[PDB]
C-alpha cells in the first residue's frame, strides 16, 4: 500500500488549496478511513479531517468551514480542498489512511504566498587526503529543491543543508560531499537538482578548478 500526495506547492492568499492523494495497492472502499494531517515547518502535527468507510466526514472544528474531503473511487484517490488560505496554512500536508498501522504519504509542502514561482540557478562549489565539493542552488521560490549526487549512486559523505531564506525573499541551498582527493582526476561528480514548482531540473558537473 502506497500513498502519494500531489498538488501545487504554491497557493495565493485567499485562494483555495487543492491536494490529491493517489492510493496504490489498495482500494479506497476498503479503508477504515482516509484523511489529512499537516505540519507547519519546524512545528508539530495538526489533524485536518477524515472520511470514513460509509463516506461520513469529520473535520477539525477550527478549520471546518474551509475544508472538503472527497473520495474518487474511479481513480482510487481522495482529495483535500482548503479554501481562503493564508500564510498560516503554509505546511507539509500528509495524506493518511487505515487499511492498527496507518499508511502515510510522503508529504507535500504547500507555501501560501503572494510571491511567484522562480527556478534556481546552479553554481559549482569546485574542489581545487580529503576534498570537499558541492553545488550552490540559488534564488528559487518556493521550497523545496531536491539534490542528489551522481544520480543517487553517491550518498556517502553527502550533506544537503536546510535552505536559507535570503533578504531578497528567495531561497538558497548548498549541497556538499567529501571525497578522496586522489579521485578528483578520474571520477566525475554531478549534482542533480530538481525544483518541481518551476519544473526546473539541472545536472551540473562539478569540475576541479585551475588554481
Amino acid at each position: 500500500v502506497q500513498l502519494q500526495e500531489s498538488g501545487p506547492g504554491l497557493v495565493k492568499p485567499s485562494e483555495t488549496l487543492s491536494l490529491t492523494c493517489a492510493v496504490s495497492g489498495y482500494s479506497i472502499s476498503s479503508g477504515y478511513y482516509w484523511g489529512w494531517i499537516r505540519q507547519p515547518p519546524g512545528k508539530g502535527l495538526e489533524w485536518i479531517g477524515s472520511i470514513y468507510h460509509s463516506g461520513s466526514t469529520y473535520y477539525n472544528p477550527s478549520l471546518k468551514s474551509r475544508v472538503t474531503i472527497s473520495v474518487d473511487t474511479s481513480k482510487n484517490q481522495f482529495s483535500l480542498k482548503l479554501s481562503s488560505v493564508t500564510a498560516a496554512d503554509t505546511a507539509v500536508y500528509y495524506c493518511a489512511g487505515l487499511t492498527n498501522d496507518a499508511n502515510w504519504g510522503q508529504g507535500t509542502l504547500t507555501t501560501v504566498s503572494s510571491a511567484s514561482t522562480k527556478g534556481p540557478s546552479v553554481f559549482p562549489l569546485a574542489p581545487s587526503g580529503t576534498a570537499a565539493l558541492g553545488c550552490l542552488v540559488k534564488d528559487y521560490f518556493p521550497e523545496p529543491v531536491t539534490v542528489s549526487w551522481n544520480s543517487g549512486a553517491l550518498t556517502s559523505g553527502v550533506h544537503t543543508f536546510p535552505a536559507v531564506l535570503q533578504s531578497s525573499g528567495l531561497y538558497s541551498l548548498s549541497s556538499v560531499v567529501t571525497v578522496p582527493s586522489s579521485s578528483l582526476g578520474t571520477q566525475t561528480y554531478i549534482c542533480n537538482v530538481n525544483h518541481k514548482p518551476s519544473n526546473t531540473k539541472v545536472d551540473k558537473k562539478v569540475e576541479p578548478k585551475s588554481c
Binding site: I37, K43, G44, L45, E46, W47, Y58, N60, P61, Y94, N100, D101, A102, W104, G105, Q106, G107, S121, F123, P124, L125, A126, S128, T130, A132, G134, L136, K138, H159, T160, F161, P162, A163, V164, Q166, S172, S174, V176, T178, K209, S210, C211
Partner: protein, 213 residues
C-alpha cells in the same frame, strides 16, 4: 498534550519521553507514539498504549498512567535520532498530537574540518558573489564563523544553516555563505573564514586571494 522539546543521551543508554495530557484526551483514550526521521512521514512505534507493530524492536516501549503517557527507548543507536510524537484522541474522538521531542545522540567531541570556496566565475558573470565556508562533521552543535574581507569583520551579510545530526556518526555540518555584489567582490583581495569550536584548541582560518583561481 505537551512533551519536552528535546532529550539526549549516549549510545547504549536509555531515555524516556513523556506526554502530559488531560482527563479528556489521554485520561480516557488510547495513546500512540510515532518516530519521524528527518524529511520522512511519522512512523508508528506504539499503539494501544503499549503494543508494538511488527517491525518495531523491543528497545521501544510505551506505558500510560492517568493523564500521562511515556515512551521509553533503550540501547540507543545513532539511527534513533528523530522527532518523537505522542498521539491520542480528544473529547470528540478526533486525533490530537504532542508537540514533538527531538532526540539527540551524545558522542565524543569532534572538531570541524573547514573548507572555503570562492564564487564561481559562472556566478560572477551573472553579477553576484557567494563565498562559502563549510564546517564538516563536528560535535557538539555550537560553532562560530567569522568572515573577514581584507581584514574587515563582516557583520550582517552572511547566512548559515546546519544539518540534522548525521544518522551514522552523529555529527553536524554547517555552511556559511557570505554575499557580496560583483563590484564589491572585485574591490578586495583576501577572503577569510575563521572557525571557533570546542574541538579546536584555537580558531582555524581558511582563506583565499581573489585571482588565484
Amino acid at each position: 498534550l505537551t512533551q519536552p522539546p528535546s532529550v539526549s543521551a549516549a549510545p547504549g543508554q536509555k531515555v524516556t519521553i513523556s506526554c502530559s495530557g488531560s482527563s479528556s484526551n489521554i485520561g480516557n483514550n488510547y495513546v500512540r507514539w510515532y518516530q519521524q526521521l528527518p524529511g520522512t512521514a511519522p512512523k508508528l512505534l506504539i499503539y494501544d498504549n503499549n503494543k508494538r507493530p511488527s517491525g518495531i524492536p523491543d528497545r521501544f516501549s510505551g506505558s500510560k498512567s492517568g493523564t500521562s503517557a511515556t515512551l521509553g527507548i533503550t540501547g540507543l543507536q545513532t539511527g534513533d535520532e528523530a522527532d518523537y510524537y505522542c498521539g491520542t484522541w480528544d473529547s470528540s474522538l478526533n486525533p490530537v498530537f504532542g508537540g514533538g521531542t527531538k532526540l539527540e545522540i551524545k558522542r565524543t567531541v569532534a572538531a570541524p574540518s573547514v573548507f572555503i570556496f570562492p564564487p564561481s566565475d559562472e556566478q560572477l558573470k551573472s553579477g553576484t558573489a557567494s563565498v562559502v565556508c563549510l564546517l564538516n562533521n563536528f560535535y557538539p552543535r555550537e560553532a562560530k564563523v567569522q568572515w573577514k574581507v581584507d581584514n574587515a569583520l563582516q557583520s550582517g551579510n552572511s547566512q548559515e544553516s546546519v544539518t540534522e545530526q548525521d544518522s551514522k556518526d552523529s555529527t553536524y555540518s554547517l555552511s556559511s555563505t557570505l554575499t557580496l555584489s560583483k563590484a564589491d567582490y572585485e574591490k578586495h583581495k583576501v577572503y577569510a573564514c575563521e572557525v571557533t569550536h570546542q574541538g579546536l584548541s584555537s580558531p582555524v582560518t581558511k582563506s583565499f586571494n581573489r585571482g588565484e583561481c
